[PDB]
Amino acid sequence: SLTDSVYERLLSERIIFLGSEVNDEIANRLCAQILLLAAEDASKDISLYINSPGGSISAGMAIYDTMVLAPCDIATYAMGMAASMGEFLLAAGTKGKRYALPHARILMHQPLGGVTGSAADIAIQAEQFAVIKKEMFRLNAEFTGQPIERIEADSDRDRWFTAAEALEYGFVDHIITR
Amino acid sequence: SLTDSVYERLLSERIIFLGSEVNDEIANRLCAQILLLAAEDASKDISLYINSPGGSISAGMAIYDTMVLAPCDIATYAMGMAASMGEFLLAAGTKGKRYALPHARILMHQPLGGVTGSAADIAIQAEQFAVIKKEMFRLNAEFTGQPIERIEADSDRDRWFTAAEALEYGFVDHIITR
Amino acid sequence: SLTDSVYERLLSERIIFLGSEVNDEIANRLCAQILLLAAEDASKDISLYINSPGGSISAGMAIYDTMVLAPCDIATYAMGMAASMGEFLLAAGTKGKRYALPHARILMHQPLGGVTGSAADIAIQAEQFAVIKKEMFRLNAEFTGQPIERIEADSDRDRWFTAAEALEYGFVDHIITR
Amino acid sequence: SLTDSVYERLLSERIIFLGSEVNDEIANRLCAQILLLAAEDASKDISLYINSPGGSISAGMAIYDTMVLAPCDIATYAMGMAASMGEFLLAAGTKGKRYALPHARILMHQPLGGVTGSAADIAIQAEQFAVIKKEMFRLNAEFTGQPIERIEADSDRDRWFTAAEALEYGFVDHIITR
Amino acid sequence: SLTDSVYERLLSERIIFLGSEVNDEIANRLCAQILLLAAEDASKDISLYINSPGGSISAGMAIYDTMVLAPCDIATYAMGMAASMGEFLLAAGTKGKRYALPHARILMHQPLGGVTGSAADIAIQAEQFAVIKKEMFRLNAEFTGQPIERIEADSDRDRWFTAAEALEYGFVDHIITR
Amino acid sequence: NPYNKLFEERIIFLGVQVDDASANDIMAQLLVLESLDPDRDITMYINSPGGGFTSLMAIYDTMQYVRADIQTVCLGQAASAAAVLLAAGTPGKRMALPNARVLIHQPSLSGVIQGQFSDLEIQAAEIERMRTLMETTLARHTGKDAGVIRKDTDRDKILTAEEAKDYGIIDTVLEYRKLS
Amino acid sequence: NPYNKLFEERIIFLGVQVDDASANDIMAQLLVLESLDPDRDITMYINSPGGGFTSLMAIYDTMQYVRADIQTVCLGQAASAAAVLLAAGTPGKRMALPNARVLIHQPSLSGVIQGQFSDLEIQAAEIERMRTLMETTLARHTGKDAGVIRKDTDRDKILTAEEAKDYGIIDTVLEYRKLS
Amino acid sequence: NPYNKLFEERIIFLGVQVDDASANDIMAQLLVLESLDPDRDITMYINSPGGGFTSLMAIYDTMQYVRADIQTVCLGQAASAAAVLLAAGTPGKRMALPNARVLIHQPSLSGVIQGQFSDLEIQAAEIERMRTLMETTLARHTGKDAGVIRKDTDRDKILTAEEAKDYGIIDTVLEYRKLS
Amino acid sequence: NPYNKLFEERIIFLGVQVDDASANDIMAQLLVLESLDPDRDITMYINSPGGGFTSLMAIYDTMQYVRADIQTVCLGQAASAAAVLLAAGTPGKRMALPNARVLIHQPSLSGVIQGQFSDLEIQAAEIERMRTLMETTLARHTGKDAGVIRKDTDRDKILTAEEAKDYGIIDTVLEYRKLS
Amino acid sequence: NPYNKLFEERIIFLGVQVDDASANDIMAQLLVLESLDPDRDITMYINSPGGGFTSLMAIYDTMQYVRADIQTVCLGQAASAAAVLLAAGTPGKRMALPNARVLIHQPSLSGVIQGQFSDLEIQAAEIERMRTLMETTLARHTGKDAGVIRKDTDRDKILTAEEAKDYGIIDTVLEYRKLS
Amino acid sequence: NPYNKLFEERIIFLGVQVDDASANDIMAQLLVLESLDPDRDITMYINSPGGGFTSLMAIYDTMQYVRADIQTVCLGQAASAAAVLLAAGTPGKRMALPNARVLIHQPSLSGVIQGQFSDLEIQAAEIERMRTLMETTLARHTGKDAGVIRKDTDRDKILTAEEAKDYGIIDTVLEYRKLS
């Protein structure tokens, strides 16, 4: 497979891609790649390129904890669009190495979900939603430096940022030009 | 796979193809190839052959920023048809190496999209459309040298160019004959 | 894959096949093969065997320009049926090396298409149809030596040629016997 | 793939199979194999084993011309069933090396097709049918030695032959026993 | 593919399997394997293991003639179930080497088919059915030693045999115990 | 509606593919009309692209059975079972409009009858019987030898109204009655 | 419509596959007609390609149960359950048109009955019982020994109207009543 | 409903694709209206995007056959079979509204007719016959030579109401009758 | 039901997408109402999200043709063909409710018309003709130059009831008649 | 049936999603009832989970337009368009049952409107206009400033019957009339 | 049919899943019956496997609102919304047949409600409100504390007719009235 050939050559250069909706398949593949790269050489950086329409929160947390706990620094790049969990994982890179490319778009929005069970089960599902919402906003606040109150207000509806606006906001540290 | 065998042999010659509707799969594969080729040799040119019916704007921006930031010059060729993001990426090659083939067709048109949410969400989606429209036209103006006013007027409806007309307009620098 | 094994062995002998409806997948694969073969050895001929029910015009133009601009001569063979873009690409080989096999069939017909938009968009689509029709007929006239008026009259409805009739008409230079 | 492994080992022994309905995929694969085998060694025979329910006439003509023009003799074997284009290609082998196996069945019938267009297009399609019918019967007459009048009469409806009857009729030269 | 790995290792030991409904794909693969094995070494036996719910008669005849004409002896084993063409091919092995396993089941039944055309075509199809029925029963009689009258009577409806009953009847020569 | 009025005028309109349900409706109409008035004529209008053979013979026997004469008029086309039923009308009252088309051909199946060869021997025998009976019926009503019909119906044989007259399927071609 | 008029003439038209719903409608019609006039005859027209056995016995018992004689006339064809019901009419009043076709064959399933082997032992026993009962019923009404019928119905046995008479399924073949 | 009232005024509304079922309904209406009053005129309103040829000739012969004059008025559009039927009205009474559109073109198939080449020779011959008959019919009613029509109908030829008048398909273009 | 009562009051309710079948029903209603009383007015209520152009011109000519004045009242919305038909009412009697929405835009296709380039040249020519005719009709009824309308209808142009009055599509905006 | 009896008592039952067809039926009923008796009140029962905005304004204008007072009673729930229509009843006669639920929220789309950005600019502008008009209408009938409503309807705001009274959507909550 | 006769006897048959359309029909019937005779009792027969909560409260308020006493009789089963409606009948007239089954359980969703977490906070709040209201209503009519009901309805609680009496859902279990 040509696509895999290219990606594997880049994996040997410590470059990994998040190229689709974050689900469990992507999260598990990507966590495996981070574990493997850190095992091969824990001193060298990993460069994670993000281009994603969004994804599941649990899968995103798998990726995020693997990134945080990896002994190596992980740099992140926003190319194309980094939406909601792409944005989270972008801002989740090590501070000082979070990059946006000049014509990237970064989208922040409150979580989506759904309600399925009996009134009792729905009370439980709603409680868990409340917890998730607070935790995701807390982590965005830690990433960007914005007050959590501002994250909650801004993420109410789709909030689009250009690379420049993302730099001022605090999602990224640098915008790459050349 | 024979198709992949041919493409990989050409990848080793720094030739890469954009052969379908630009979506995230194509954009990510192609960005990976550009990164890889630039890593192997940053002094040599990359030749990008474009034959595409159109595609998504976010994916196209991923490709475009990867092209711009690559340390190597990227030449572009219009074969078959270069429509809307094929046209954008064609005109986005380094100036002086943007080629059309004699019987190529280049199609310029304003962006397409859709509206899905509640009146509030739709106000947001429409605002983002306005921003995208202006940015795409600005970049076409930078590529061709035409006033942005002319890009907006011409792209109102499907505007077809022959290779000769594309040369006069400013999408390409040369038409290849032999 | 056995089919690919056979085709790749033949690719090493500078033999390539156009075996299906010309679309963008076939056109891109075939253009890549022609580019690759010309790169390997630009002095030796390429033998293109054509057996195709028809295809898209834009894809066919990609193939045609790649054939014309390749530094090497390209010979063409009509086996089975060469219909409409198979016929075009057959007649598009270098003059003096366009072959028909004795029981081949060559089909010439005016382009097909469709109309989809609003009255304004339809006016545009119809104008582009007129342009395409004239260009395809002009190129057939250049290939065969027939007046363009005759191409337009003959291609009005399905016009079938036997290999002998195709030789007299001017689609091919020789009919192979042995 | 095990099936391909077996077939490729046999290809190296100059044995090729026509194992399904003749369509363009089979015809192109099989023509490629004949071209390749003849290129490797033009003095040695090719053994073509036929087991097919029928197929398209254009694809069958591609196969047939490739067989005729190959510089090497091509032997044919009827195993299982050789129906309509299997029968044609069986009888199309070089005279003196067309074999039936003892419990093979050979089926001869007039062509099938269909009518789709406007009255004008249908007049054209019917004319082309008449031409095809005559040519297929002429070639069967050349193969078997029967008068063309007899081929036309016998092929009116499904005409089944046993291997012995096929030998007397003239489809094959020998029936293999051991 | 693991399944293919196992089967290919066994092919090198001259063991081949008929593991599904006999159709043209299976018949062609299996005929290719028998031809290949006989070519590699025509003095050594081939061991054919049969486990099949039934299959097409034409495909079965391809297999059967390939078995008969192969220069090497072919031993057959009934494992699981040998139904109708599995049974035929089981009984079709060389006499003295047709084996049943102790808990195998062997099913004999008259052919199935269908009627599709106009009254004239149906008269033809029915005539061909009569011929096929007689030939299949004749061959079963040759295999087992039973009078053809008995084969026709017994095969009227599904006639199940245990391995012991199959040994007494004459489908197999031995039942393997260990 | 128009069809109930036509029925009140003793008119049956055979305007559908002659399926089994269609044959049931036609036979019910013929039986009712005979009951209402055994002496007054019944007119059957025929415009149908096809039908099955079993349904054909059902209608055919009901048409011959009822006391009332049946006038048959071919509008549009009478194809295969409609063609036999057109021929089966009362002699002297089988008529067609000038551009009426009559299509006669051997009976055929659609889909596939599957079973054991022993079942298909029987089914094929019955289908050959149905062909023989169709050809015999047409011979009885057209005056052509059943052998000639057997040859003619091998392939779709399309007759114009005038040819249908010469071939013995209808007695006359209707003249237009326009007053002007 | 024609069917309501036929009903007012004490005519039941068995023109459909004898499903369970169809059997319900037929039995309702027989019961109503008996109530309206127990002495006057009921005529049942039979034209049907098939039906189930359980529905067959439902209709059969209702036909034998009602006080009124039931005249049975085969139009088109009487197949499998329609054939038994044709035989089941009142003796002396079982009739068929000249080209009527009668098809008798053992009962059969469609689809698959699935379950444990212990459930399928019971289902197979019941199906054998249904075959036995079908053959016994035909023997009662045709005069042939049930063993002969059991052999005859092994494969589709198709009888012409005349053969149906000789075989004991009908009492007479109807002559055409055309006045001319 | 409006259509039953129109019928009571001797008005047929040809508002559908002229399929076989549609042709049956139209012919039934024409026959009933002739029966009710052979002398008083019938008016047929035409608004239909298309139809088949066999259905066309069915309706055409019924229109010429009935004693009553048929007035034909094109509303909206008369396409292919509706166009021939518009031309086929009684001379002097073929009319269209000012923006009525008339579309004439050679007959065509949809889907695919499949078979042996020998069957398709016959089917192609019949389709050429149908084209010839369409063109001949239009020549009879328009006054143009059948050769001219054969050329004109090669591609979709769309006529305005005024052009339909000049081309011989209608006798006059209706003036608006608005009182104000 | 409410619609039959409205019809008895000479009210047509154009409440559906103006398809071909819908246009047939509307034209039948207009013709019947003219027949019943040529002098008394007809009121057409318009509430429809769209419709085709061919159906539009069918209804348009029928509306202009009938003797009775047609009052047109826009409820809800009048979109594309409903908008033209709203403009096409009798001058002085074209009215809309205060929040009525009028949407005018160039005609468009849905799906795809496929064929040879030579067929699509004709189809594109006809579609341009339809656009020209739509714009000309609106110019005739609104007083705006057809060129201005051609520019305005390039993109969906949505008019409020008041704007529809100023733009010449309606004569007045209805006042609420609530007694309290 | 119950609904025809309710209509005879001048009762409209708005029991369905307010689609375009539903709005047409409601408007037809209102128009007919006004015609029958302009002075006597009309009662509209509201129980509906939703509806579109264009249909909403159609019904709204018809409700304000007719001479008769309209009493609105909310049974079950009045959601989004039913809620506006509940507010739109005649002041002093807007009522709800004790457990009636009223749901007000900004208008929304379903599916996707696709097109060029220039078309979607227009569609988005129209949707914002529809939101503004909804909020303005509710302000007119509830007494709350349109800005307050614009904020309140941002997310689904569910009111109990008592809250609907305090919020200005209904005038009173109905007491149970049980005699015991 | 039987249901119209039952209605003429002031009987409503709640025999379906209580969907929104079903609730509309029930409320229409209750309103009509109250109008016909405010003093005479209404009997509602309950046999239903389920229903939604919003429909439940719609019917519940209509039942309490009408002047006439409502007698409720449980046939078969009264599940979830049918169970609440059974409890909601007039005290002293809530009855069930001996083997009637009453099933009470907390309200639940089917499918999935999707949206932003902020929308689902509201939807979950409303669903908890609906549970609270269901339990409160049953407490009002059964005499059990709402807390006890809240615990009991956590899982499907199935009551026999006798248990439904002891639990306060019905007043008495009907004795069989067979004369013999």
Curated annotation (Swiss-Prot), chains A, B, C, D, E:
Signal peptide coordinates? none
Q: Which NCBIfam families does its entry note?
A: PRK00277.1, PRK12553.1
Keywords from the named record: Cytoplasm, Hydrolase, Protease, Serine protease
Q: Which GO terms describe its molecular function?
A: ATP-dependent peptidase activity; ATPase binding; serine-type endopeptidase activity
Q: Which SUPFAM superfamilies match?
A: ClpP/crotonase
Keyword Hydrolase in record: yes
Q: How does it assemble?
A: Fourteen ClpP subunits assemble into 2 heptameric rings which stack back to back to give a disk-like structure with a central cavity, resembling the structure of eukaryotic proteasomes. Forms a complex with ClpP2 and ClpX.
Alphabetized Gene3D superfamilies for the sequence: 2-enoyl-CoA Hydratase, Chain A, domain 1
Q: Which reaction does it catalyse?
A: Hydrolysis of proteins to small peptides in the presence of ATP and magnesium. alpha-casein is the usual test substrate. In the absence of ATP, only oligopeptides shorter than five residues are hydrolyzed (such as succinyl-Leu-Tyr-|-NHMec, and Leu-Tyr-Leu-|-Tyr-Trp, in which cleavage of the -Tyr-|-Leu- and -Tyr-|-Trp bonds also occurs)
Q: Which family does it belong to?
A: Belongs to the peptidase S14 family.
* Biological processes, Gene Ontology terms: protein quality control for misfolded or incompletely synthesized proteins
Q: What is its EC number?
A: 3.4.21.92
State the protein's name.
Answer: ATP-dependent Clp protease proteolytic subunit 1
One family from Pfam that matches here is: CLP_protease
Q: Which GO terms describe its cellular component?
A: cytosol; endopeptidase Clp complex; plasma membrane
Functional summary from the UniProt entry = Cleaves peptides in various proteins in a process that requires ATP hydrolysis. Has a chymotrypsin-like activity. Plays a major role in the degradation of misfolded proteins. Degrades anti-sigma-D factor (rsdA) when present in a complex with ClpP2 and ClpX. Does not seem to act on anti-sigma-L factor (rslA).
Q: What is its main location?
A: cytoplasm
